[PDB]
Design a protein around this ligand. Structure first.
Ligand SMILES: Cc1cc(C#N)cc(Oc2ccc(Cc3n[nH]c4nnccc34)cc2Br)c1
Lengths: 401, 552
């Protein structure tokens, strides 16, 4: 087994991302891992003639796991892992009754990395109070978290899977990052039985959410128009605002029959009766918002982006789109703000993977530093989606319940 | 010496060839001094003579006591690769654990005791010119890390790291701190056994080409290092002298602020808000700035705190950190970190406006976050906080606020001023409360404002601002409704801008208008605020927009 040559391009140099401070328990957790991995020859120490860095973290059960943040490296390797050596996305995956995710990250350790490419995998284990310069490393085998790894490894992956595919051709399998997404329409017992079978196959070679995903029972969260016994002026105003902003997404939303109600200068508290055409306009808008958005389609060349709103009482709402407010999907999520926020990210990112074969750039409603301090404390994923930090317009929070 | 440690390989930048910088004709005193210096250096293995085949050159200069060789490595530095950052941070005394015995060791000629990558040495070429450049100069090249070379600091660190490794393994008790030339060693074992442990280290260092101080030359505590004083069981900043001046320049105020900021690591309650405000508005370096009364007030109070020396304690891993924060002044906060009540490990301050408008609860969270990062860096863990805010107050805020926020273990501590939400917008519209439909136009070119309103009690009013953005008028209109209204009020706007601003419950702003709106909001008994789409023809919003729009 010899190595696939890799590259960035003539343009773009490698990643020089700073290492975010880690607590003592993790720094220690990371040295145990990095000692074992150096003895096993997977990684090896490095001198400062390597100017590149990628952040590393420790996550989880009782056992720790090393997570390496290859977000910059992926961005700078896109030609390699997407166009040159890509993995196609099956549109059937989302159609399946059940999808089970399996971690096939160990696979990548038994495959050497292009010696010319190893300098771009440098990371630092930092030292408390900057006591020591802190332990520098780089990878010799394929690293987990880098998108090139499955890109390279797919030829060997096909072999491993061939018998299983042949024997179960209505089971669809997708490889993303360190994970196999394996979906079937079998009954839950038979499905699980089939997953255990796939485990054995893998075994012979080297190897939110809630157990298994169930894609076909994923549905849009409609913009909810209340039914209400009695309607006040305020309530109509609120209803008009939703419908005025929904019309910027949904072909056919109408608000005219409701303006008819709000006359000239009424008190907000004043009740007002429910007119016929307003009654119809209301119900006809309702039916529109059940359905997906007419006119909006996934363009694989554009980035997916996700916005999430904190709805209070452990409620979160979210929307995925490529062009602002033109939603490919909207949804919902339901013990502390950051913990939940991180669960929602992971969830939404999973859906994004099952549906379009990539993760969205998140617009997270939280102060940069709070998130950077705490996201890892509850993070369970093998990947890390791209995020920026945004103040939620208080109106948008309102419009999605 | 020169370490036997294998050299670190060193490339130039991918597209680049090495420097061919012309040597400037130097003077005899200098030409002489260089020869003299390069001889003694050559005979110690630091440099080596070379042929005319090597095409590379770097200027050399000599300067006075004393004579020093200065190489102008600018062009080579441009051409050599980037290296990894030497360090992410400098240690903080507060993080240093207490130990019985502690020794400082500075490495002699640290750079010149480390080899350069053979394949790179060619590029370090430089020439001592002959008198009046009449004949071929003497040509040399470094075998060791040159002074002023981009890669010396990184390569040295790497070398010293590699070298220390086995000792660290063989002696996982001994704490060794790496910083530049220096090496700071500490242990709990007794003053006999330490001095041997020091010597076998010094030996290990010597075995790898690294000279080091004899026990008659090792310094004694207190260690004056990097602005601090490190005593055997306490630490502090070095002496602070706040100058006594009639007239203060911009230069004097900058140095004062700088000293106070340094002071604030262990001296509580230090404040700089008012001294800082002076510095705004690009004045001249030496230009005198009259102190305000609040500046003068501030300086006086800083002098009180500094008058008696304050010291800090060292860290004890077997205990929790406790972080306490006090509010003091709008914008300004101050904190203390200790493990045993009021024996401070360290101290600090936080001012910082995140944006134009904020409130204390938001600022308190921001300061907790800053402190949390600080602790993780210094001690590798987060402290237990003790905050001047009620759980019940905090609870109300975070749940109703749209941002996700979170802080680790904390307890209330009654240390006034106390952080409180100064007002609370209603959640539902208010019966028996006049609904003001506010609006605000502004002609783009002429800047003439027309901020006004209409109400359900019949009232209608429009004013005229001058030189206002459309933001300003829509915001002036709300202040209008808050001025002419009673102790209850529903306000209706089509400006999301103002809405968002006010729904954040600001108690403090960089805007003037907003601080006036806050004044009102605090005084009212109940305010409810709603938003509508402009120009969609809303009962009320259309009525106001009429009288508000008149004037292009
Ligand atoms: C950053 C840095 C600079 C310098 C210098 N010069 C020395 C250092 O080492 C240390 C300093 C203080 C302490 C506490 C300490 N415990 N016991 C002591 N006895 N004498 C002095 C300091 C200490 C430990 C180390 Br070990 C660290």
């Amino acid at each position: 087994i010899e190595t696939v040559p890799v590259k960035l391009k003539p343009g773009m140099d490698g990643p020089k991302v700073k290492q975010w401070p880690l607590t003592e328990e993790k720094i220690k957790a990371l040295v145990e891992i990095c000692t074992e991995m150096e003895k096993e020859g997977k990684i090896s120490k490095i001198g400062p003639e390597n100017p590149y860095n990628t952040p590393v973290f420790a996550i989880k059960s009782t056992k720790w796991r090393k997570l390496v943040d290859f977000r910059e490296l992926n961005k700078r390797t896109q030609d390699f892992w997407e166009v040159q050596l890509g993995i196609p996305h099956p549109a059937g995956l989302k159609k399946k009754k059940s999808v089970t995710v399996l971690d096939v990250g160990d696979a990548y350790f038994s495959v050497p990395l292009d010696e010319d490419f190893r300098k771009y995998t440098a990371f630092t284990i930092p030292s408390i109070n900057n006591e020591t310069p802190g332990i520098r490393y780089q990878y010799n085998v394929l690293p987990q978290g880098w998108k090139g790894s499955p890109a390279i490894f797919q030829s060997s992956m096909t072999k491993i899977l061939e018998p299983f595919r042949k024997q179960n051709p209505d089971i669809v399998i997708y490889q993303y990052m360190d994970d196999l997404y394996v979906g079937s329409d079998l009954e839950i017992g038979q499905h699980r039985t089939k997953i255990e079978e796939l485990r054995q196959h893998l075994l012979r070679w080297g190897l939110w959410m809630g157990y298994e995903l169930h894609p076909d029972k994923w549905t849009v969260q409609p913009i909810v128009l209340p039914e209400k016994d009695s309607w006040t002026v305020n309530d109509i105003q609120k209803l008009v605002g939703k419908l005025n902003w929904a019309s910027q997404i949904y072909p056919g939303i109408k608000v005219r029959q409701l303006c008819k109600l709000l006359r000239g200068t009424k008190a907000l508290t004043e009740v007002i009766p429910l007119t016929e055409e307003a009654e119809l306009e209301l119900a006809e808008n309702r039916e529109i918002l059940k359905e997906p958005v007419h006119g909006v389609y996934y363009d694989p060349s554009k980035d997916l982006i996700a916005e999430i709103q904190k709805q209070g009482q452990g409620q979160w709402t979210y929307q995925i789109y490529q062009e602002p407010f033109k939603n490919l999907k909207t949804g919902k999520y339901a013990t502390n703000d950051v913990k939940q926020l991180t669960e929602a990210v992971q969830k939404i990112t999973t859906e994004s993977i099952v549906i379009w074969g990539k993760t969205p750039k998140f617009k997270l409603p939280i102060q940069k530093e709070t998130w950077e301090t705490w996201w890892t404390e509850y993070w369970q994923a093998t990947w890390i989606p791209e995020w920026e930090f945004v103040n939620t317009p208080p109106l948008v929070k309102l419009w999605y319940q | 010496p020169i370490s036997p440690i294998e050299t670190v390989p060193v490339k130039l930048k991918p597209g680049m060839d090495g420097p061919k910088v012309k040597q400037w004709p130097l003077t005899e005193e200098k030409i002489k001094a260089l020869v003299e210096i390069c001889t003694e250096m050559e005979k110690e293995g630091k440099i080596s003579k070379i042929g005319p085949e090597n095409p590379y050159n770097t200027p050399v200069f000599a300067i006075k006591t004393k004579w020093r060789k200065l190489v102008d490595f600018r062009e080579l530095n441009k051409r050599t690769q980037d290296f990894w950052e030497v360090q992410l941070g400098i240690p903080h005394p507060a993080g240093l654990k207490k130990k019985k015995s502690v020794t400082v060791l500075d490495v002699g000629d640290a750079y010149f005791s480390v080899p350069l990558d053979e394949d790179f040495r060619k590029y370090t070429a430089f020439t001592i010119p002959s008198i009046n450049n009449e004949t071929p100069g003497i040509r040399y090249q470094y075998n060791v890390l040159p002074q002023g070379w981009k890669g010396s600091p990184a390569i040295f660190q790497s070398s010293m790291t590699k070298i220390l490794e086995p000792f660290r393994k063989q002696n996982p008790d001994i704490v060794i701190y790496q910083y530049m030339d220096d090496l700071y060693v500490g242990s709990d074992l007794e003053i006999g056994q330490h001095r041997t442990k020091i010597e076998e280290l010094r030996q290990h260092l010597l075995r790898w080409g690294l000279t080091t101080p004899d026990k008659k030359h090792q310094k004694e505590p207190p260690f004056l290092w990097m602005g601090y004083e490190l005593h055997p069981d306490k630490w502090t900043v070095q002496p602070i002298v706040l100058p006594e001046k009639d007239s203060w320049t911009v230069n004097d105020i900058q140095k004062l602020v700088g000293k106070l900021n340094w002071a604030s690591q262990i001296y509580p309650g230090i404040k700089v808000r008012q001294l800082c405000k002076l510095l705004r508005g690009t004045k001249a370096l030496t230009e005198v700035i009259p102190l305000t009364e609040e500046a003068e007030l501030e300086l006086a109070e800083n002098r009180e705190i500094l008058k008696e020396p304050v010291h800090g304690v060292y860290y004890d891993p077997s205990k929790d950190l406790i972080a306490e924060i006090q509010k003091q002044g709008q914008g300004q906060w101050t904190y203390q970190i200790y493990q045993e009540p009021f024996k401070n490990l360290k101290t600090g301050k936080y001012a910082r406006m995140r944006g134009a408008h904020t409130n204390d609860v938001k600022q308190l969270t921001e300061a907790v976050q800053k402190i949390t990062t600080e602790s993780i860096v210094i001690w590798g863990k987060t402290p237990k906080f003790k905050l001047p805010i009620q759980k019940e107050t905090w609870e109300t805020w975070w749940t109703e606020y749209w941002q996700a926020t979170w802080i680790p273990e904390w307890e209330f501590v009654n240390t006034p001023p106390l952080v409180k939400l100064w007002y609370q917008l209603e959640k539902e519209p208010i019966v028996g409360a006049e609904t003001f439909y506010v609006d605000g136009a502004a002609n783009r070119e002429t800047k003439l404002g027309k901020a006004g309103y209409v109400t359900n009690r019949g009232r209608q009013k429009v004013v005229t601002l001058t030189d206002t953005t459309n933001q300003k008028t829509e915001l002036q209109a709300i202040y209008l409704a808050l001025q002419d209204s009673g102790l209850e009020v529903n306000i209706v706007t089509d400006s999301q801008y103002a809405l968002g601003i006010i729904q954040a419950q600001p108690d403090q702003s960089e805007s003037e208008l907003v601080n006036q709106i806050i004044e009102q909001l605090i005084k009212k008994e109940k305010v409810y605020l709603a938003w509508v789409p402009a120009h969609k023809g809303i009962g009320g919003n259309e009525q106001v927009d009429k009288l508000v729009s008149a004037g292009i």
